[PDB]
Amino acid sequence: ESETEKSSDIAQVKIKDVSYTLPSKYDKSTSDDQLVLKVNVAVKNTGKDPLNVDSMDFTLYQGDTKMSDTDPEDYSEKLQGSTINADKSVEGNLFFVVDKGKQYELNYTPESYGDKKPKSVTFKIDGKDKKILATADKLQDSAKALSAYVDVLLFGKDNADFEKITGANKNEIVNDFNESAKDGYLSASGLSSTYADSKALDNIVNGIKEGLSKNSSIQAKTTSISKDEAIVEATVKPVDASSLSDRIEDKVKDYYSKNSSASYEEAVKYALQVYPEEFKKLGPASSEKTVEVKMKKNDIDQWQLDMDDYRAAELVEAFIKE
């Protein structure tokens, strides 16, 4: 008997690892404020007869309260019900619904004939331990990365962390985004593909981005992690552009009330000029929209957003309410 290794005459239990995890996308026993404690254990049969070892043989207490056992997204990641003969060992993970940073107690009762207490082993787990707490911090890494993408792409904000955090190069992803955005704007407003590489259209992009950086908000939370891919829940407060139509219509009229003999080209070009300055005048909308976005982790633990994924488009579309 010691801190992470304890034994009875019939079994030996070793706690190989302890970390905080986010619940399964399909977990229904956890709260938004709860985590899942992942305890990797090893059970050695120190007895003679074969010993059945199951997840059900372990219970966790938080304080004096018994906590629920839970399942990961892929149940194969959990300790499997098996049988082990003398000196044979099974190894696997255990999952329990917990409130972060508490005092846990893991109890193991071997599947044996007779009295529980003598054959059982109990371990104390300090949830406020620095190492264990570190694991809880890495959980929102994907949301940090999603927010960096929003900063560089949508807000036009600088972010020296972007390359380090995501693995993508800002200059390329931003230029591609800005071109796609200009091309999409022209088609949506039936204008000539000529205006694509013009000051007017770059001022529109730079203006929209300045407006969103100030008058729109994103709250990003990683809700689930499953192997090399996470789910980030983006709660977006959009800019209310409901009035933008009228504002340009009114500024355009104010340009006809000025110069009567103004052609359709003169007035169109002027409308594309006031657009940035009028967008920058709009405030956030009352409502919020929550978009689920999938991030993908690499080897060097960097999270990425696929710009071609429909969920990325939905995230971008969520920033402006009409």
Sign of CA dihedral 117, 71, 232, 173: positive
Do 125 and 225 share a structural domain? no
DSSP code per residue over 216-229 = -EEEEEEEEEETTE
Name residue 138's amino acid.
K
Domain count, the chain: 2
Given the structure tokens 């200009």, which residue do they identify?
182
What whole-number distance in Å separates Cα of residue 10 and Cα of residue 116?
A: 11
Domain boundary among 80, 113, 129: 129
For 253, residues 6+ apart whose C-beta sits below 8 A from its C-beta are none
Do 311 and 186 share a structural domain? yes
Do 95 and 56 share a structural domain? yes
Do 119 and 147 share a structural domain? no
What whole-number distance in Å separates Cα of residue 3 and Cα of residue 19?
A: 16
224: closest CA among 167, 288, 168, 293?
Answer: 293
Identify the experimental approach.
X-ray
| Cross-sheet strand order for the sheet of 35-44 | 5-7, 12-21, 35-44, 89-98
Do 136 and 71 share a structural domain? no
- Give the count of beta carbons closer than 10 Å to the beta carbon of residue 64: 7
Do 302 and 173 share a structural domain? yes
Domain boundary among 129, 158, 187: 129
Do 64 and 75 share a structural domain? yes
Do 157 and 107 share a structural domain? no
**Eight-state DSSP code of residue 22:** P
Q: Based on the number of CB atoms within 10 Å of its own CB, is 169 exposed (0-12), middle (13-18) or buried (19 or more)? A: exposed
What whole-number distance in Å separates Cα of residue 169 and Cα of residue 274?
A: 32
Q: Which residues pair with 6 in a beta bridge?
A: 13
Q: What is the SS3 assignment for 120?
A: coil
- Residue 316 sits at φ, ψ, to 5 deg, of -60, -45
Q: What is the SS3 assignment for 110?
A: coil
> What is the radius of gyration, based on Cα positions, of the chain?
28
**Number of helical (H) and strand (E) elements in the chain, helices listed first:** 9, 16
Helix (H) or strand (E) holding 264: helix 264-279
Do 299 and 221 share a structural domain? yes
- The answer to whether the CB of 191 falls within 8 A of the CB of 133 is no
Q: Pairing between strand 82-84 and 51-53? A: antiparallel
Do 142 and 112 share a structural domain? no
Can you give 201-216 as a three-state secondary structure string? HHHHHHHHHHHHHHHC
- The answer to whether the CB of 41 falls within 8 A of the CB of 78 is no
Domain boundary among 71, 103, 129: 129
Do 277 and 159 share a structural domain? yes
* Residue 48 domain boundaries: 1-129
- The answer to whether the CB of 196 falls within 8 A of the CB of 186 is yes
Do 184 and 304 share a structural domain? yes
The string over 114-140, giving b where at least 16 C-beta atoms fall within 10 Å of a residue's C-beta and e elsewhere, is eeeeebbbebebebeeeebeebbeebb
